[PDB]
């Protein structure tokens, strides 16, 4: 059940690529209707729009390293460290 | 005078009740609590002030005709002078901040043009409008075993 | 209004009416139709209670001794937003205190 | 967690709601000075709200992290020559 939850996890992750990217075609048409006196309206917004949401494309670079982390990835057993001292005392006499 | 004007005031009381809780939470400092909850519970209570601020603009003909102070009966002999700046309303520094709205009004401005400059203000807004039907149009783009009782009834033997 | 008035005026009641129009300096013409009477007071100087009721003024004006003179010339006759603009200012102190909260 | 789906897909609907009323930033006297910082705060509020649901879901993608003994032979054979080769 590690697959369904990382399945919804890249199934919400691809809903961010339709999220940060629509923050592209949002900035584009603001330069076409542009060339006007006040055409700097969308410049306080769009440029606050793709300045703001372009750090939501930062959060889209952390997702795949998590699914590349599936590629990349009292209470002790230290009783076996008494295997470690053990080998040493057999090492001292041997 | 305003048989329904009082039902507007009870809706000023519903919105004023947004202040009640808010300000008694202010004093609820300085020990820190629930930013998400309160912030959202402060924002939400603020909005409605504007929406009762809205339901007033439909009645805006009676704040213009103004219905105004035919209203003061009491004869509160002097001490209502504080009810007089209180009845008085008028504008606070917020007015000092209204001229900051006047220098933000900046320029502009009339005396500036008469008309055809204004008709270039309205023809200036209306073109911000069409850019939005080009906007919404590109937006829709990506949009079994028996319940343990009977088993304890099976600890009662029941089959 | 005006203070140098009552200092030498000695207001009283119905002679304190004029100390208003003249004090506030707001009465123009149709309050000056009551200036045609005191200007024909100075220019001149050189039952029927069922034939009466104003009742806007008869169910209000009640007991006045002479508005009568202006009542016969009243026989011949013919901002709840600004209390809410300082409660707009109640919004700004929450606007800047909410804004200074934002920092 | 099917409720991270119901809230953060209502947060997805919130990214959907957050782009909705924000760009929606619109083009009375007292109340039309009102609505103009009403969306500077409540468009950008809800903007730090899906910015907060950006962080909530940015670092809550991170909470998706979550013998030679030879029996007693090599035990008691070296459990003597330890201590009786210790004192003797």
């Amino acid at each position: 059940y590690i697959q369904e939850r990382l399945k919804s996890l890249n199934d919400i992750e691809t809903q961010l690529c339709s999220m940060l990217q629509e923050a592209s075609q949002v900035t584009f048409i603001f330069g076409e209707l542009k060339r006007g006196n006040e055409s700097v309206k969308p410049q306080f917004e769009n440029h606050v729009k793709q300045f703001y949401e372009r750090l939501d494309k930062s959060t889209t670079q952390l997702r795949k390293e998590i699914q590349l982390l599936d590629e990349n990835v009292q209470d002790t057993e230290k009783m076996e460290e008494q295997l470690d001292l053990l080998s040493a005392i057999l090492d001292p006499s041997k | 005078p305003g048989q329904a004007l009082d039902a507007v005031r009870m809706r000023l009381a519903q919105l004023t009740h947004s202040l009640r809780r808010i300000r008694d939470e202010m004093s609820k400092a300085e020990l820190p609590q629930w930013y998400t909850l309160q912030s959202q519970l402060n924002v939400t209570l603020s909005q409605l002030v504007s929406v009762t601020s809205t339901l007033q603009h439909f009645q805006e003909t009676l704040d213009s005709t103004v219905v105004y102070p035919l209203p003061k009966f009491p004869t509160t002999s002097h001490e209502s002078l504080v009810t007089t700046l209180l009845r008085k309303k008028n504008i606070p520094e917020v007015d000092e901040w209204m001229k900051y709205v006047r220098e933000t009004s900046g320029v502009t401005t009339a005396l500036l043009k008469d008309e055809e400059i204004e008709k270039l203000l309205q023809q200036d807004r209306e073109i911000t409008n069409w850019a939005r039907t080009t906007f919404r149009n590109e937006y829709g783009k990506h949009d079994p075993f028996n319940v343990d009782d009977v088993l304890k009834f099976t600890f009662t033997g029941e089959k | 209004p005006e203070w140098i008035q009552v200092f030498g005026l000695r207001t009283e009641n119905v002679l304190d009416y004029f100390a208003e129009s003249p004090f506030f300096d707001k009465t123009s013409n149709n309050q000056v139709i009551k200036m045609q009477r005191q200007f024909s007071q100075l220019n001149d100087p050189n039952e029927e209670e069922f034939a009466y009721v104003d009742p806007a003024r008869r169910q209000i004006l009640f007991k006045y001794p002479m508005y009568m003179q202006l009542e016969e010339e009243l026989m011949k006759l013919d901002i709840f937003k600004i209390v809410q603009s300082r409660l707009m200012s109640t919004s700004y102190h929450l606007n800047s205190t909410l804004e200074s909260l934002y920092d | 967690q099917a409720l991270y789906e119901k809230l953060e897909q209502t947060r997805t609907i919130l990214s959907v709601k957050l782009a909705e009323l924000i760009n929606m930033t619109t083009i009375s006297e007292l109340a039309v000075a009102t609505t103009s910082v009403m969306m500077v705060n409540n468009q950008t509020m809800q903007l730090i709200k899906n910015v907060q649901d950006l962080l909530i879901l940015t670092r809550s993608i991170k909470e998706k992290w979550l013998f030679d003994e030879k029996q007693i032979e090599e035990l008691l054979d070296n459990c003597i020559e330890t201590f009786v080769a210790e004192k003797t």
Binding site: - | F145, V147, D149, V150, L151 | - | -
Partner: protein, 231 residues
């Protein structure tokens, strides 16, 4: 002594996790203790309710008799038995000396706690000596018999959880009701009528797990009509 309890279940396959997720979350892994609870009515023909109960834990060679149960192990009995359910037919009633045997009594708005007062035993002998005879000879004759195993994980505040599976042995042959998956159990047997403010702190340590445990399988307590020892 008033004790309180509740339970739930999950598939056999997603019991691989839960077993070492009762190792991760409990701080102790499940451990095997065999428990066979047997019944006796009072002698049903008396005529002048709680039926008689009994228990024991037993030679590991005697439970599973086939090649010492196919070599040794601890949790290897987990994946082995579903419809194979008879390790022993019960050898009928079994039991003239009785061996160690024990019992207790428990009688009946968040949770439910029965007053449970207990006891133990050693051995029997004489005219009617045996366990079946000194059972109906005590005036209580057999109604039924039951059995199980368990895997328990130690916890804070003397809390323990034993995942279990049961069988029923009788006249028509014995078969395990563990069918369909695995079971679990946990309890706290209080000092008799112990402080209820520990009966409000007994629930809330269990509410952690109840709505923490809710969602691997829900945390809920079973019906009372089925609770009473009544027959």
């Amino acid at each position: 002594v008033q004790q309180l309890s509740l339970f739930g279940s999950i598939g056999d396959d997603g019991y691989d996790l839960l077993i070492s997720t009762l190792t991760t979350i409990s701080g102790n892994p499940p451990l095997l203790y065999n428990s066979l609870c047997t019944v006796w009515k009072p002698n049903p023909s008396y005529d002048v309710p709680n039926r008689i109960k009994l228990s024991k834990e037993v030679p590991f060679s005697y439970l599973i008799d086939e090649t010492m149960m196919d070599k040794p192990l601890n949790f290897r009995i987990l994946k082995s038995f579903t419809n194979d359910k008879i390790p022993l037919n019960y050898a009928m009633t079994r039991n003239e000396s009785c061996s160690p045997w024990s019992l207790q009594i428990s009688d009946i708005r968040s949770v439910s706690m029965q007053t449970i007062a207990e006891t133990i035993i050693l051995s029997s002998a004489g005219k009617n000596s045996s366990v079946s005879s000194l059972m109906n000879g005590l005036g209580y004759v057999f109604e039924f018999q039951y059995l199980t195993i368990g895997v328990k994980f130690f916890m804070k505040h003397g809390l323990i959880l034993e995942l279990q599976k049961i069988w029923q042995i009788e006249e028509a042959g014995n078969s395990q009701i563990t069918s369909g998956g695995f079971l679990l159990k946990a309890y706290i047997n209080v000092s008799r009528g112990t402080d209820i403010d520990r009966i409000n702190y007994t629930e809330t340590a269990l509410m952690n797990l109840k709505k923490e445990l809710q969602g691997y399988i829900e945390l809920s307590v079973p019906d009372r009509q089925s609770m009473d020892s009544r027959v």
